[PDB]
Design a protein around this ligand. Structure first.
Ligand code: MG
Ligand code: MG
Ligand code: MG
Ligand code: MG
Ligand code: MG
Ligand code: MG
Ligand code: MG
Ligand code: MG
Ligand code: MG
Ligand code: MG
Ligand code: MG
Ligand code: MG
Ligand code: MG
Ligand code: MG
Ligand code: MG
Ligand code: MG
Ligand code: MG
Ligand code: MG
Ligand code: MG
Ligand code: MG
Ligand code: MG
Ligand code: MG
Ligand code: MG
Ligand code: MG
Ligand code: MG
Ligand code: MG
Ligand code: MG
Ligand code: MG
Ligand code: MG
Ligand code: MG
Ligand code: MG
Ligand code: MG
Ligand code: MG
Ligand code: MG
Ligand code: MG
Ligand code: MG
Ligand code: MG
Ligand code: MG
Ligand code: MG
Ligand code: MG
Ligand code: MG
Ligand code: MG
Ligand code: MG
Ligand code: MG
Ligand code: MG
Ligand code: MG
Ligand code: MG
Ligand code: MG
Ligand code: MG
Ligand code: ZN
Lengths: 61, 51, 91, 157
RNA sequence: CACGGGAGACCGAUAGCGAACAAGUACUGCGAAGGAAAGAUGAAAAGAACUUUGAAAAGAGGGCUAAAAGACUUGAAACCGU
RNA sequence: ACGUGCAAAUCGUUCGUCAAAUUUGAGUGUAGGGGCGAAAGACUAAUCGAACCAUCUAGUAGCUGGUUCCCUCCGAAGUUUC
RNA sequence: GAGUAGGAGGGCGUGAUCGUUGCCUAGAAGUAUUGGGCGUGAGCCUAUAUGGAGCAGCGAUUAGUGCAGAUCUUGGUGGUAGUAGCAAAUAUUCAAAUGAGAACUUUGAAGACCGAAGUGGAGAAGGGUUCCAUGAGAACAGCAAUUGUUCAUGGGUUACUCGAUCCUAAGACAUAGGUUAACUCCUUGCAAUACAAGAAGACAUUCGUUUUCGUUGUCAAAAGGGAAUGAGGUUAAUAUUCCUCA
RNA sequence: AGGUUAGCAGCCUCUGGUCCAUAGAACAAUGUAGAUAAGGGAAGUCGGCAAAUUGGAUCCGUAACUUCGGGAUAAGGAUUGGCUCUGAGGAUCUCAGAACUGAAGCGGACAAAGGUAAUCCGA
RNA sequence: UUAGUGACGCGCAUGAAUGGAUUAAUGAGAUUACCACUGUCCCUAUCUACUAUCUAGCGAACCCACAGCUAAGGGAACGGGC
């Protein structure tokens, strides 16, 4: 089961870089079923696809 | 690139159509020796002339 | 370097397609086609010069829309205005 | 693709034949796996090939010696050099399996099959290219296999 | 030279026009110009039903047919295996 | 270093110059005994002390190489003259 | 009774032609032979196997008539050899899933790299469907592959405001005139080596009529000049183009 | 884009991208690349080839020669961290002092000239 | 010190824009010292990565009369063959 397309679409939808995407490992088949973008947004709304917090870069020092 | 003549577009279209494989049912004719289309072409290995 | 590293620099193209003969023989800087010479307005080919040419481009090389039937109707006397007629003689 | 085996068995109800043709495995390697199988019990051949695959045993190199590694495993043979040409072994093994399943319809017993006549032939070489310095090109090919093996039943008194 | 006719102590698929074949074609060259390789299953597809082992290619059974002649007529030598 | 390359000129270190006689895209002017040259007989599509393509052209070769079946018989010259 | 260079006399073997005598689906040619023989030798006859349609002798006629070589032509193959080798560009690892098969596919979890002079986001030249989706046997992706820039099938490129199209440049080419056996060649924006070459208006609204002013062409810039658009949303693949709003 | 910095250098990072370059194991000679050698210091070699030394900034100090522009970072001599205070320059971030503290180290990586004296050419 | 520099000059064969003599700046331009410096050397050792190694997979090329142990001898005056 390749999710390549899932991930690209999810990226665009979330207006974020692919490496920020998180596709739930457990629900993967379900995700593979998403074809259209719309499917993707439903997916994100449902919580199967999420968007990772940015890598923390701090100015303390 | 992006920018093209009509002539170009049409020529490219032509060669694009001509680049199909022999239709699988032609090989069943009684008078033909043709197993395949010998004239097929791949953009990477052979280049057209358009300028 | 005259070699491989040199070849990278070739994106120019000195010829384009000649309306008349349709190869890329057209010289935009000289305004002529190296093969036919499209502007010249009579076909450029040197026959004695070198011998193969006519069999590549030349009369009979591509389909001849008009001439093929000329052979046939040459013998038939160039009929104009005639219609074929039944041997059965129906009136 | 109709196999003509160069050698024939004496009793063909008492024999089992396998052949595979136009394989992609290395000739010399296959050759020597086979050469090593000749004259054993089908069950033995299978055990020992499986053992080569598991690296606990070596397939002796006989005809094609060209710079082949010396192993302690070659003791079993009287030899210095041998290897573990896995691909070849797997293919051959598959062939032995076809031998055994090939015995089924015959209603023959496995225990008394002995291997006589392995035949490995150099098949038509598959062709491709290699780019060489100065803009030369040289051939890069593979030497394919034809294999055939038949098994006789021999009764042990 | 073109379209026709007929013919030959010609040639007979490395011969004969370069081309017996989607041949001035595939392909190369900015270009002028260069330019090949490639013909024969059988009288008829009857082009291999079906069983079995294989993930699959395929093997073993079994069958067509005068014959497998099965991607194909004959099938030499060099080379290689038994 | 590589030198049957990654490469028919590359790779590592190192080095010349780095706001001008600087670098650079396209378009446009110059073509073969002709161009073009801060001049090296340099460059002119891997071709240059005269490009490339076809033709005269199977160019001529007192010179190099090859010159295809059997047997039997006779059997030389390396000297003379120009 | 020697013999290179060389010469002579006889003979062997190969096409095709005119004759003559014949052989072959009751198996010709060709091919293989550790079968049997014939010639001093070119070569021959037979046997067996294969083969599955044509052959052969004798007398002449004719010749693209005999190959070990020419760094000979074209094609096919060896030994070298499972050898040289697959080592630039810091890096991978774990579990799950999928599959006949996973170091090389997908998710997640870790560790590193390019470090905004990028291994990022978009263009011009060049490429031309390489883009998108689904599927996948062989081949190719110099290990591998369940993966692909590969194969098969279908589908994708919407504009008054972006660019071409218009303008002029370095330039260039017609026309006219002249040169050439002819082809060709020479001039032309400061426009002519040319010149009875144009434009506009109105009424008319055709002509015609009429009036006015007048020497005569075109091509060359997808970085130059250059009338006006934006944000938001949408597709698997297009969008300053489609949708919505302004 | 952030940090360091004279700096769009180098080195490290965030956004975005990527781990693609066939793999496993052994660890000999020879090799390719990378470093370090006690005592001496070019004796090596056609030749200091290669390597080594030098390197920033602040303060000192600076010849012959000259076309008076130059030479010139000439040559050479010192300093550089951390920490705790002090003073001066401005609107309605630079500079200087003092004291304390360490294996006397401190341009700690990165970055970064080795000099001198002659001879020959060509400005 | 056949090296470098300064002098002398019976200059093989120096000499005036076929330029002669000078010369600051200047140089990836020729040469000689010296200072610093050092694995260039005495004199060679050790450490890292990639190779060579071995393995799974993949897999060329040069070249090749015939081949491959020597001593002498003779021989187209250095044989592998006699
Ligand atoms: Mg284009
Ligand atoms: Mg290409
Ligand atoms: Mg090409
Ligand atoms: Mg045609
Ligand atoms: Mg025609
Ligand atoms: Mg076979
Ligand atoms: Mg290579
Ligand atoms: Mg079968
Ligand atoms: Mg048969
Ligand atoms: Mg043999
Ligand atoms: Mg370099
Ligand atoms: Mg002479
Ligand atoms: Mg003939
Ligand atoms: Mg019969
Ligand atoms: Mg006879
Ligand atoms: Mg028979
Ligand atoms: Mg005769
Ligand atoms: Mg012959
Ligand atoms: Mg021969
Ligand atoms: Mg070979
Ligand atoms: Mg290498
Ligand atoms: Mg990369
Ligand atoms: Mg990019
Ligand atoms: Mg992009
Ligand atoms: Mg102009
Ligand atoms: Mg002009
Ligand atoms: Mg505008
Ligand atoms: Mg609009
Ligand atoms: Mg390794
Ligand atoms: Mg020392
Ligand atoms: Mg010293
Ligand atoms: Mg010392
Ligand atoms: Mg040095
Ligand atoms: Mg001064
Ligand atoms: Mg100083
Ligand atoms: Mg000085
Ligand atoms: Mg202090
Ligand atoms: Mg102070
Ligand atoms: Mg102190
Ligand atoms: Mg220091
Ligand atoms: Mg020095
Ligand atoms: Mg100079
Ligand atoms: Mg000395
Ligand atoms: Mg002296
Ligand atoms: Mg100097
Ligand atoms: Mg091991
Ligand atoms: Mg191996
Ligand atoms: Mg001697
Ligand atoms: Mg000897
Ligand atoms: Zn033309």
């Amino acid at each position: 089961v390749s999710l390549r397309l899932q991930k690209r679409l999810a990226a665009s939808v979330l207006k974020c870089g692919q490496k920020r995407l998180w596709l739930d490992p457990n629900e993967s088949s379900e995700i593979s079923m998403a074809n259209s973008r719309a499917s993707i947004r439903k997916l994100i709304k449902d919580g199967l696809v999420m968007k990772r917090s940015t890598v923390i870069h701090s100015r303390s020092r | 690139g992006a920018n093209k003549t009509l002539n170009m577009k049409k020529r490219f279209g032509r060669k694009i159509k001509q680049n199909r494989p022999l239709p699988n049912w032609y090989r069943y004719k009684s008078d033909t020796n043709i197993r395949y289309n010998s004239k097929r072409r791949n953009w990477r290995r052979t280049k057209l002339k358009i300028y | 370097t005259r070699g491989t590293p040199a070849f990278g620099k070739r994106h120019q193209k000195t010829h384009t397609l000649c309306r008349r003969c349709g190869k890329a023989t057209y010289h935009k800087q000289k305004l002529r086609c190296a093969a036919c010479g499209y502007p010249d307005a009579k076909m450029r080919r040197y026959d004695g010069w070198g011998q193969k040419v006519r069999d590549r481009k030349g009369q009979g090389t591509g389909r001849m829309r008009y001439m093929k039937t000329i052979a046939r109707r040459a013998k038939n006397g160039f009929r104009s205005g005639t219609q074929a007629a039944p041997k059965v003689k129906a009136a | 693709g109709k196999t003509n085996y160069s050698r024939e068995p004496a009793n063909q109800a008492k024999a089992v034949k396998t052949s595979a043709s136009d394989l992609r495995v290395h000739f010399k390697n296959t050759y020597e796996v086979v050469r090593a199988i000749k004259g054993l019990n089908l069950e033995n051949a299978k055990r020992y090939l499986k053992a080569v695959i598991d690296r606990k045993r070596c397939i002796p190199f006989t005809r094609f010696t060209g710079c082949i590694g010396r192993t302690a495993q070659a003791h079993e043979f009287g030899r210095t050099q041998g290897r573990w040409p896995v691909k070849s072994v797997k293919v051959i093994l598959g062939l032995l399996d076809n031998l055994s399943a090939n015995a089924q319809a015959k209603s023959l017993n496995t225990a008394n099959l002995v291997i006589q006549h392995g035949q490995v032939n150099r098949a038509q070489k598959g062709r491709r290219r290699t780019y060489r310095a100065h803009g030369r090109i040289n051939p890069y090919l593979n030497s394919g296999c034809h294999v055939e093996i038949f098994a006789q039943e021999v009764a042990a008194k």
